[PDB]
Amino acid sequence: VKSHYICAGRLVRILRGPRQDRVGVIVDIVDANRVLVENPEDAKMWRHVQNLKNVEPLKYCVSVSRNCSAKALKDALASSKALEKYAKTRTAARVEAKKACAVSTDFERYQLRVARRSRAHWARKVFDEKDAKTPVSWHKVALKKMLKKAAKMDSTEGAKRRMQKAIAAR
Amino acid sequence: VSRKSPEYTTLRKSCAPGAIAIILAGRFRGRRAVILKQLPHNGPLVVSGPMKYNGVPIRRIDSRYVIATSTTVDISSVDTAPITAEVFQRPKAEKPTLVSDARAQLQKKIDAALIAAIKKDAQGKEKAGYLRSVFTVKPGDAPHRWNW
Amino acid sequence: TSKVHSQRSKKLHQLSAKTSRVNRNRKAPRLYMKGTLAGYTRGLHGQTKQTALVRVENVNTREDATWYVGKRVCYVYHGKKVKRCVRWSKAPARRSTTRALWGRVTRPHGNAGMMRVKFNGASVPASAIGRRIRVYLYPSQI
Amino acid sequence: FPSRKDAFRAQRKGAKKHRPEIIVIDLKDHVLGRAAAVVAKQLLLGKKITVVRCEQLNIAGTEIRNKIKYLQYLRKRKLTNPTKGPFHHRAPSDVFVRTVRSMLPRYTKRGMKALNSLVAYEGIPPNVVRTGGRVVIPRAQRHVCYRSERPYTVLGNMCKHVGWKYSDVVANLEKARVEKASRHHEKQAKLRDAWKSARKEALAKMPKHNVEVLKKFGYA
RNA sequence: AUCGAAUCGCCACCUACAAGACUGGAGCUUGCUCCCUCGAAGGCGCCAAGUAUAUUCAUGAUCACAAGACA
Ligand SMILES: [K+]
Ligand SMILES: [Mg+2]
Ligand SMILES: [Mg+2]
Ligand SMILES: [Mg+2]
Numbered sequence: 001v002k003s004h005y006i007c008a009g010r011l012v013r014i015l016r017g018p019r020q021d022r023v024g025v026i027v028d029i030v031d032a033n034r035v036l037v038e039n040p041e042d043a044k045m046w047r048h049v050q051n052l053k054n055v056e057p058l059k060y061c062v063s064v065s066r067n068c069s070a071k072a073l074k075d076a077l078a079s080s081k082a083l084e085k086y087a088k089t090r091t092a093a094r095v096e097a098k099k100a101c102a103v104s105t106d107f108e109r110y111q112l113r114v115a116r117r118s119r120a121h122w123a124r125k126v127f128d129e130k131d132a133k134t135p136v137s138w139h140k141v142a143l144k145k146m147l148k149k150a151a152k153m154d155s156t157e158g159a160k161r162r163m164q165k166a167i168a169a170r
Numbered sequence: 171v172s173r174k175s176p177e178y179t180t181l182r183k184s185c186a187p188g189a190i191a192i193i194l195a196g197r198f199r200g201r202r203a204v205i206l207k208q209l210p211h212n213g214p215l216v217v218s219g220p221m222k223y224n225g226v227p228i229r230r231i232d233s234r235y236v237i238a239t240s241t242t243v244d245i246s247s248v249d250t251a252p253i254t255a256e257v258f259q260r261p262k263a264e265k266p267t268l269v270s271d272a273r274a275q276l277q278k279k280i281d282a283a284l285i286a287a288i289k290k291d292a293q294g295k296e297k298a299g300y301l302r303s304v305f306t307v308k309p310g311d312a313p314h315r316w317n318w
Numbered sequence: 319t320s321k322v323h324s325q326r327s328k329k330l331h332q333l334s335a336k337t338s339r340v341n342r343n344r345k346a347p348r349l350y351m352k353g354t355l356a357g358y359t360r361g362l363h364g365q366t367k368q369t370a371l372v373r374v375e376n377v378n379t380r381e382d383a384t385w386y387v388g389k390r391v392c393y394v395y396h397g398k399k400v401k402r403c404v405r406w407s408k409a410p411a412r413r414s415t416t417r418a419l420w421g422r423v424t425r426p427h428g429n430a431g432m433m434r435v436k437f438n439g440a441s442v443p444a445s446a447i448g449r450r451i452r453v454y455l456y457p458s459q460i
Numbered sequence: 461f462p463s464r465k466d467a468f469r470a471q472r473k474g475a476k477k478h479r480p481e482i483i484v485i486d487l488k489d490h491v492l493g494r495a496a497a498v499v500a501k502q503l504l505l506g507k508k509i510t511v512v513r514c515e516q517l518n519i520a521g522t523e524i525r526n527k528i529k530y531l532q533y534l535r536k537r538k539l540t541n542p543t544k545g546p547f548h549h550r551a552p553s554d555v556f557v558r559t560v561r562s563m564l565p566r567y568t569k570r571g572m573k574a575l576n577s578l579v580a581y582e583g584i585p586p587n588v589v590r591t592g593g594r595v596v597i598p599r600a601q602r603h604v605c606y607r608s609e610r611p612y613t614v615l616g617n618m619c620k621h622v623g624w625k626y627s628d629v630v631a632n633l634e635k636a637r638v639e640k641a642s643r644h645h646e647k648q649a650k651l652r653d654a655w656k657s658a659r660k661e662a663l664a665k666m667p668k669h670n671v672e673v674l675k676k677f678g679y680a
Numbered sequence: 681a682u683c684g685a686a687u688c689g690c691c692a693c694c695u696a697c698a699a700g701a702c703u704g705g706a707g708c709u710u711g712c713u714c715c716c717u718c719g720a721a722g723g724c725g726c727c728a729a730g731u732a733u734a735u736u737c738a739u740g741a742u743c744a745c746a747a748g749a750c751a
Contacts, residue, residue, distance in 0.1 A: 001702065002719095005711065056720095061712085090718060097678025106192075106318050107241045110300050112677050114731060115670040120723085121730055122662035124338045127654065131338075136651050138692050139333045146333075150326060159323070184460065194456045195743055200347035214742060224727090225737035232742055234457040260741065268739055277738080288733095295733060306347035306726050309689060312376040313351075314385035318460055341690060341751040343725055348688060348746085354505055373505065394745050396685040404744050411747040415685045418745050447570065448506035450687065456743075472681065476750060480687085484695095593694040593722080603700050638697070645696040655693050655723080667731065679721090 004057035008066050011058040011082060012037065012050075019044060021095050023058070023086070025073065028066050040074045041083060060086060176210040184238040185215065188245040191236040192305050193217075198226050200305050204243060204284060205236075206250050216253055220281040223301045228277055230258060239318045241300070243291055248283045252276055351375065353451035355393070355442065359434070370435045370442050371427055372451050383426035383433050388459075391421040391435050392452040393442060423453070482508045486594040488516040492559060492615070494600035500563040503574040510579045512588060514553040515616035515630060518602050523613040523621075530622050550623040552615045553580040582626075583634050589641075 004010065010026045024037040024045050033052055039045035060082040064073060077083065086092055104112075131137050135144050153159070172178065185191070189205050203219040203226045215233055219226030257276065288297055307313065353374040358365045372391070377383055396415045403412055421437035435442075435451075483502075487495060495517070499509060519526050538545030549558060557580050565571035581588065598604070606612055620627040663671060663680070674680045 001711075002704095003702065003711090007711090059718095088718090091720065094678055094720070097676075100677060102315075103317060105241070106239045106316075107296075107300060109316075110303055111296065111673055112679075113303075113726070114299065115673040115677075116679065117725090118666050118670045118731065119659070119662050119674065120725090122665045123655075123658045124340075124729090126661050126665070127658040128338050130654065130658070136654050137338070139336060143330075143334055146326075146330065150330060162323070194349055194454070194458060197738095197740060197747090199349050199746090221737065222735080227738035229738080230742050235743065237455070237458050237460050258741075260739085270739085273738080295731075298733075299728095299731070302727070304347055304727050305349075307349060307351065308726065310376065312382075313455070314377065314382050339729080340724060342727085342729090343689070343751050344727055345688085345751070346746060346748045347726080352688085356505065390743085392745075394686060396745095398685095400684060405740090405747085409740065409747055412745080413684080414745080415683095416745050417686095420744080448504070448574075452745085454743095469681090469683095473683085481689095590695060592691095608701070641696040643696095648693085652693055659723090670731075 004059055006035070006052070006055075006057060007061065008068075009062040009064045009076070011060045011062070011086070012055045013058060014050070015054050015056055017054060021099075023083075024050075025062060025064075025077070027064070027068060027073065038070075038073065040070065040077065058086065179208060179212055181208055181212075181215075181233060182238075184240075185233050185236070186238075186242070187250075188243050189238050190241045190243065190301070191217065191238050193226075193231070193236060195235045196231070198224075198229075201226055202301050202303065202305065204245070204301075205238070206245070206248070206280075207253060208233075209255055213255070216250075218277075218280055218284055219301065220284045221277065222281060222285065223298065228253070228273075228280060237318060241297075243288055243297065245284065245287055248280065248287060250280070253280070349455060350392075351377075351453040351455075353391075353453050355446050355449060355451050356432070357447055367441050368436070369424075370421075370437065372423075372433050372435050372453070374431065374433065374453055377431035377433075379431055380426050380429050383431045386423050386433060386453060387425060388457060389423050390454045390456060391423060391437075392454070393419045393421075393446055394450070394452065395419075395446070480508055482510055482591070484588060484591060484594045485509060485511045486513055486596060487511050487556070488513045489602045490517055490597060491600045491602060491605050492517050492519050492556070494605065495597055496556065496559045496563055498597050498600060499578070500560050500574075503560075503577055504564070504570075506574075506577075508577050510581070510588065511553075511556065512581045512584045512594070514556050514580055515582045515614075515619070515627070517552065517556065517615040518606075519613050519615065519618075520606060520610065521613060522611050523618060526613050527618050527621060530618065534622070550619055551582065551626070552619050552624070553582050555615065555619065556580055582630050584637060589637070 014020055014022050024039040026035050027038055028036040034049055037050045038047040062076045062080045064076050131140055135141050187205055187207055190202055191205050193199055193201050201224045203217040206216045208215050214230045218228050221227050288294055351374050353372045356371045356373050358367050359369040397417055400413055400415055405412055421435050424434045424436050427434050534548050536546050561575055564574055
C-alpha cells in the first residue's frame with residue numbers, strides 16, 4: 001500500500017520541536033498517541049517519549065524486539081546499514097541543504113546567486129540551438145508557417161521590381 | 171583612555187578597518203564598499219569602495235547607516251595616514267565633476283593601493299565581483315533571519 | 319499600394335533575428351520592508367491614538383519583531399500644492415506634492431509579529447489606515 | 461465602461477496598460493465560514509481579492525439541514541412593506557459575499573471600501589483564466605478541517621434547490637473551460653520537455669566550481 | 681493640456697485536472713520486499729548577455745519620499 005507502518009524498529013524523523021529534522025528508532029509503543037524513541041548515533045537522541053503527531057515514518061525498519069537493550073539496538077543498526085542507505089536519498093540531501101542555507105553569510109549568498117545565473121545563461125544557449133533546428137518556441141513556430149506562404153508570392157515579378165527599387169532607394 | 175582624548179572610541183567590533191560594508195542610506199544606497207578608518211574623537215567612518223568598481227569615492231559615513239559583514243580584506247599595506255578631517259573640511263562661502271587636485275591625487279593613491287591589496291588577497295576575483303554586486307530587498311525576503 | 323507588403327517584410331526580419339532573452343531588473347534598489355497600518359491601540363472602550371500598530375511582511379513571530387525595535391518608519395502621501403521640503407534650494411528636483419511623516423518602532427505587539435510605532439510629535443492620520451508603511455533598516459545594530 | 465475624457469487623458473499622457481495587484485482564490489472544497497473570516501481580515505488589511513468557483517464551497521452537516529436553515533432565513537420579511545425588507549440572494553457567489561459582509565463594519569466608509577474591494581464569480585470566467593496562478597487557503601480546506609466520516613454539503617445543490625436558476629449553465633461553461641485548458645496543456649508538453657532537457661544539459665557546459673556550489677546548496 | 685503627485689516582481693516553463701482511508705512501477709506474504717528519475721523545490725530576476733584579474737562614476741560634500749522608475 002506504499003505507506004510505512006508504525007512498528008518496533010521503524011525509523012522515523014522528528015517534525016517539530018527542539019529535536020526537529022533528526023532521526024530515531026522506535027523501541028516500544030505506549031498507546032495510540034505515544035511511542036518511545038532512541039538513537040545511539042546522535043548525542044541528543046537518548047531514550048524518550050514522542051507524540052505520534054510529531055513523527056514521519058521512513059522506509060527502513062531494523063529487526064529488534066520491544067523494549068530492547070541499548071547494546072542490542074546498536075548492533076542491529078550497524079548490521080542493517082539503514083543510516084548509510086538513508087543518507088544517500090534526495091530528501092536527506094534536501095534537509096542538509098536547508099541547514100546550510102540558514103547559516104550562510106552574505107558572501108556565500110552572492111556565490112550562490114552567481115552559480116544560478118551561470119546555469120540559466122547556459123540553458124538559454126543550449127535551448128537556442130535545438131530551437132533553430134527543430135522549431136518549438138512561439139516565434140520560431142510562426143516563422144515556419146509564415147515563410148512557406150510568404151515566399152511563394154514574394155517571387156512575383158512586380159514584388160521583385162518593387163523590392164529592387166526600394167532596396168536601391170535606400 | 172580618557173573620554174577627552176582623541177583616541178577614545180566606542181565603535182562596535184564588527185566595523186573593523188578592512189571589512190566590507192553595505193550602505194543603507196544616501197546617494198550610494200545599496201552599494202558595497204570597504205571600511206578604511208574612523209576619524210578621531212569618535213567620529214564617522216571613511217569608505218572608498220573603491221571607485222573603479224562601484225563608483226563610490228572616498229566618503230564619510232556614520233556607523234549606524236552601514237551593515238558590516240564578516241568578509242574582510244587585509245588592508246595593512248595601504249597606509250591610510252593622509253586621510254584626516256582637514257581634507258573633509260570645506261571653506262565657508264558668504265554673501266552669494268569639480269574635484270580638487272589634492273583630493274584627486276589622494277583618491278588615485280588610495281585606490282591603487284586598495285586594488286593591489288584586493289588582487290593580492292586570495293579569492294580576489296570573487297571579492298571583486300562581490301564589490302561590484304548590488305544589494306536590494308526582494309519580495310519574500312526576511313533579512314531579520316539572515317546571518318551576515 | 320497596400321501596406322501589407324512592407325509590414326510583413328518587417329515582421330519576417332523581426333521574428334527571425336530575435337533570440338531567447340529575459341527581463342532583468344537593473345533599476346534603483348529598494349532598501350526598506352513593506353508594511354501596512356492596521357490601526358491604533360484600543361480596547362472595547364475605545365482607541366488610543368498616539369500609538370499605532372503596523373504589520374510587516376514576512377514577520378510572523380514575536381522574536382522576528384524584536385529585531386526591528388528602534389528602526390525608523392515613514393508614511394508617504396501627497397497633498398494638493400507644492401510646499402517646502404528638505405533641500406528645497408540645494409536640490410530643486412525634489413520639489414513635489416509628495417510628503418512624508420516619520421516615526422520609530424518601540425516594542426512588539428502580541429505573538430504574531432505586529433509592532434507598535436510612535437510618530438514624531440503628532441500622531442499619524444486616520445486616513446492612513448490600510449495603506450503602505452515603510453520600515454527602513456537603519457539605525458543598524460550589525 | 462471608461463469615459464471619453466478618461467480615454468483622452470490616457471492618450472495624452474501616453475501610458476501603457478495598467479493592472480493593480482489582485483489575488484485570485486480558488487474556493488473549491490473550502491469551509492465557508494473560515495474562508496470568509498480569512499478573506500475579511502485580508503480585505504480590512506487592504507488587499508484586492510477575486511474569488512472563483514463559489515458554487516463548490518462546503519458546509520458541514522446534511523443538505524436537508526442546511527436547506528432548512530436557509531428557508532428559516534428566507535422567512536424573515538418586513539410585514540408592512542416587503543420591498544424595504546431583507547433581500548435574500550440565491551446565487552452561491554452572493555451567499556459568499558453576504559457572509560463576508562456580515563464580518564465587516566458595513567456601516568462605515570472603511571467597511572464599504574473593504575467590501576467594494578471584493579469580486580466574486582461562479583466558475584472561472586475568461587477574463588480571469590489567463591491572469592496567473594490561483595491560490596488556496598491551507599487552514600480552511602475540507603480535507604484538513606472535516607473528519608471524513610461525517611457528511612457535508614455542496615453549496616451549489618442547496619442554492620439550486622432553494623431558488624438558483626443557473627446551475628446547468630455554470631456546469632456547461634465549466635466543462636467547456638476544462639476541455640479547452642486540457643487541450644492547451646496537452647500542447648506545449650514538447651516545449652516543457654525541451655526546457656527541462658536544456659537545464660539538464662547546461663551542467664556539463666557551466667564551470668566546475670559553480671557546479672560544486674550548486675551541489676553544496678542542493679540545487680544540483 | 682492643467683498634472684506636481686501615493687503604489688515599487690515578471691514570464692509565450694505557474695497561469696490544466698483530480699485525491700488526502702493511497703501519490704513513481706511491480707510482487708505476493710498484505711505489510712513487507714525489489715526496481716526507478718529515489719517520491720518535502722513553478723522558471724527567471726538582484727549590475728560584464730556571464731564568472732573572467734574588462735570598464736565613466738566624486739563637490740548631490742554624514743539620515744531626510746526614490747534627485748530614479750516602459751525589467
Ligand atoms: K423582503
Ligand atoms: Mg563631511
Ligand atoms: Mg457584525
Ligand atoms: Mg520622489
